[PDB]
Structure formats: structure tokens, C-alpha cells
Design a protein around this ligand. Structure first.
Ligand SMILES: O=c1[nH]c(=O)n([C@H]2C[C@H]3O[C@](c4ccccc4)(P(=O)(O)O)OC[C@H]3O2)cc1CSCP(=O)(O)O
Ligand SMILES: O=c1[nH]c(=O)n([C@H]2C[C@H]3O[C@](c4ccccc4)(P(=O)(O)O)OC[C@H]3O2)cc1CSCP(=O)(O)O
Ligand SMILES: [Mg+2]
Ligand SMILES: [Mg+2]
Lengths: 198, 198
């Protein structure tokens, strides 16, 4: 809830609120049943298409066709606990929450579907909290909760502390102290927020 | 062009790059030919529907229906000089340009059409520069060029200097020193940028 200055938290959409990896695998197997695939536990590296490309020639292009398809983003399921956690977080005194998400380059469906997904799970009033950007470094905040290990852009010294949200692709990564993780929404996100408050 | 830290400039879309006011009036007159309208020179106040609502009962709702319609955003014409200026600006050494735009609440068409409009006038590579947000105060930069007089949000002390881009609705407004204007894209935008450089 708005403040003074409230603590400001940026929450990533794909891989944090919306299950991109699981949605991808389900749709990939359904469309391409005779192709090999990567079980979620075996995912390595941020870029799904790069791992698929090494598995068999042509699979990178087939992987791409999944996320470029209509309804891919809209039909993603929420991660367990994500809706409940972010609704609670937004309701806290002196706490402003933004959903900070990078859309894919193919813009026909993705931006629209991300607004529609937020309306669906968080309601109309949460639409005011959406920031779409390919550069999260130019968005100022106290915290950024995001599954991508390397978050870079035009601002060499972002104001936020990046808290790494665990995903299968990043789960084995050793981080440089004092970088830290949110292991899932069942993990103690309120302690992380409280650590940044005056 | 990217840097160190480049000077960072946020450029508004509606009323700065895209002619929202002219597009609105043209489509309003075409759809509602028997209703009274507001000539552009006579526009007062940021909110078009508020002025229309005072003109005749029911006109606020008719005005709204124009911007909620398919192709409203996509078919906006660029302001004179806007495309040329922003292409030149983005090409300058040590200068990063973002298009920082607030979409309307009705999300069916507007976000998509804004990406499509940028692709059309600036090309595919400029899509990486789009930031969609209802709160521009949480976007950090040196400058924000925007026709709205009152730009507020979660951050009480934005990093940018807001340069007021002239529109008929704001042209008579006296600003509190040291606030300043860009009167049109024919005006000396490079001098304003240079004033913020080290
Ligand atoms: O975790 C991911 N895993 C993944 O495999 N992809 C695919 C889709 C498509 O996205 C991009 C992408 C790159 C940067 C930002 C967003 C998407 P594309 O738009 O095609 O360039 O990258 C190649 C592809 O890779 C994309 C993501 C990023 S989701 C956005 P955020 O959570 O970082 O906000
Ligand atoms: O200059 C304007 N003149 C104008 O009459 N309108 C209408 C459309 C619709 O937009 C909103 C609007 C409010 C804030 C931000 C963006 C749009 P709505 O989405 O319906 O709440 O406000 C009421 C309506 O008023 C909207 C604008 C803002 S364009 C966005 P930016 O240039 O500030 O980024
Ligand atoms: Mg992510
Ligand atoms: Mg504007």
C-alpha cells in the first residue's frame, strides 16, 4: 500500500509469477510429440532455445514457435504461492509492488496477453502496477525479484538489489556474496523485504 | 548511442511523438458528425473527455469510445519532426533514448498497437527502447519530455527533469521556475540535452 517513500519492490513475471518453463514444455510436447525434449530438472542456461538447439538440429526454431504462438503467455499457470504472496505484499503498509516484465520481440500477442493475465489473477486494479521493459536497470526500486542471473542494461549501477528467484535453470549457480535468493514463494519473502526497510 | 553512463532521455509517445489530439478529433467528427466538438486551438485541460463532458451530456462516453476502438493508436500520425528528431537523438554519442508511454486501462488494442506503431516509424531495433508504465516516476533518467503538466507517482523525487512538451491543452500554462518547455520538435532539443551533460 502507498506511503514519504514506500519500499518499492519489482517482481518479475516469467519464471516468478507465471510458469514459462512448465508451460513451454507442455505445449512443446503436445505440438511436437515425436521430438526429444528437456525435462525441467535437466534445464541448464537461461535460454530454452539454446539448450533445445544442442539437442537436435531444427529444434531451436520449433521451440521458438511455441512462445510466438497465440495464447502461450495467457495460458501460463501461476507458480505455487505467487498470487497469494504478491497480493499480500501489495497490501502491506509502506510497500509499493510493480510487476516488471520484458516482453518478447514478437509483439503480436505477448504484451496484450500479459495485461490479460494480470487482470485474470490479480484483478483490474493491479493493471496500474505493470511495467513492460527490455531494460530493468532503468527502473528504480529497492528490490528486484527475478530468475535471470544476469540483469544488465543502460544503467551501470541500478538502485535495486537483485534477489535471484530460483528456477531449474539457475538452481546450481553459485552467486557472488552478498547476492541472495528467494527459493520459492513459500520462502520467507517478508524477511527479505524487512531487511531493506528503515 | 550507448556509452560509463550515457545521458538518458525518456520521450513520451502520446502528444509528443504521436498526434493523439488530432487523431481523436478526426475520428470523433467522422463517427459523430452531428455532435458538437472542440477545435484543437480551444482544447483546455489534459483530459479530453472532461472538456467534452461539459459540452453536452453523454459526450464523455462518446469521446471514450474513440480511444477504446481498434486502430485508434495504430493510425495516429507522427507529430511533425518527431521521427526525424528522435532518430537523430538516438544516434548521438553517449545518449540513450527510451519511449516512455502510459497505455490506457482498456488493454485489448492499445499496448499491441503502440509496439506496432514504433516498429512502423522507427523500425524493429527501436522496439528494445519501449517502456510501458502508468508511473513514469519509477523510471530513472536525466530528462523526461512529456506534454502532461503534472507527472506524479510512487517516487516523490524523480531523477529526471521534466521538460514540458507544448500541446494546445497546456500552451497557456505558466510553469514554476526553473521548469521549461520544448515548444515542438523544430525547437532546439539538442541544447536542452547538452545542458544536462557533464
Ligand atoms: O527466461 C526466458 N527464457 C526463454 O527461454 N526465453 C525465450 C523467449 C524469447 O525471449 C527473448 C527475450 C530476450 C530478452 C528479454 C525478453 C525476451 P526474444 O524476445 O526472442 O529476444 O529471448 C529469446 C527467446 O528466449 C525468454 C525468457 C525471458 S522471459 C522475460 P523476464 O522474465 O526476463 O522479464
Ligand atoms: O493526454 C491524454 N489525454 C486524454 O484525453 N487521455 C484519455 C484516454 C484515457 O486515458 C486514461 C489514462 C490515464 C492515465 C494514463 C494513461 C491513460 P485511462 O486509461 O482511461 O485511465 O485517462 C482517461 C482517458 O483520457 C489520455 C491521455 C494520456 S495519453 C498517455 P501519456 O502521453 O501520458 O503517456
Ligand atoms: Mg523471468
Ligand atoms: Mg503525452
Amino acid at each position: 500500500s502507498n506511503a514519504g517513500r514506500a519500499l518499492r519492490v519489482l517482481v518479475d513475471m516469467d519464471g516468478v509469477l507465471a510458469d514459462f518453463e512448465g508451460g513451454f514444455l507442455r505445449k512443446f510436447r503436445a505440438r511436437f510429440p515425436d521430438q526429444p525434449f528437456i525435462a525441467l530438472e535437466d534445464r541448464r542456461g537461461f535460454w530454452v532455445s539454446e539448450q533445445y538447439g544442442r539437442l537436435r538440429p531444427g529444434l531451436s526454431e520449433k521451440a521458438i514457435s511455441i512462445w510466438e504462438s497465440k495464447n502461450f503467455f495467457f495460458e501460463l499457470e501461476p507458480l505455487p504461492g505467487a498470487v497469494e504472496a504478491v497480493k499480500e505484499m501489495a497490501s502491506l503498509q509502506n510497500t509499493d509492488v510493480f510487476i516488471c516484465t520484458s516482453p518478447i520481440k514478437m509483439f503480436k500477442y505477448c504484451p496484450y496477453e500479459k495485461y490479460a493475465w494480470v487482470e485474470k489473477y490479480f484483478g483490474p486494479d493491479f493493471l496500474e502496477q505493470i511495467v513492460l521493459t527490455r531494460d530493468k536497470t532503468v527502473v528504480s526500486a529497492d528490490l528486484l525479484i527475478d530468475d535471470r542471473p544476469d540483469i544488465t542494461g543502460a544503467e551501470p549501477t541500478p538502485s535495486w538489489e537483485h534477489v535471484l528467484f530460483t528456477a531449474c535453470h539457475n538452481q546450481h549457480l553459485q552467486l557472488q556474496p552478498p547476492r541472495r535468493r528467494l527459493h520459492s514463494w513459500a520462502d520467507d519473502w517478508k524477511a527479505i523485504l524487512d531487511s531493506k526497510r528503515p
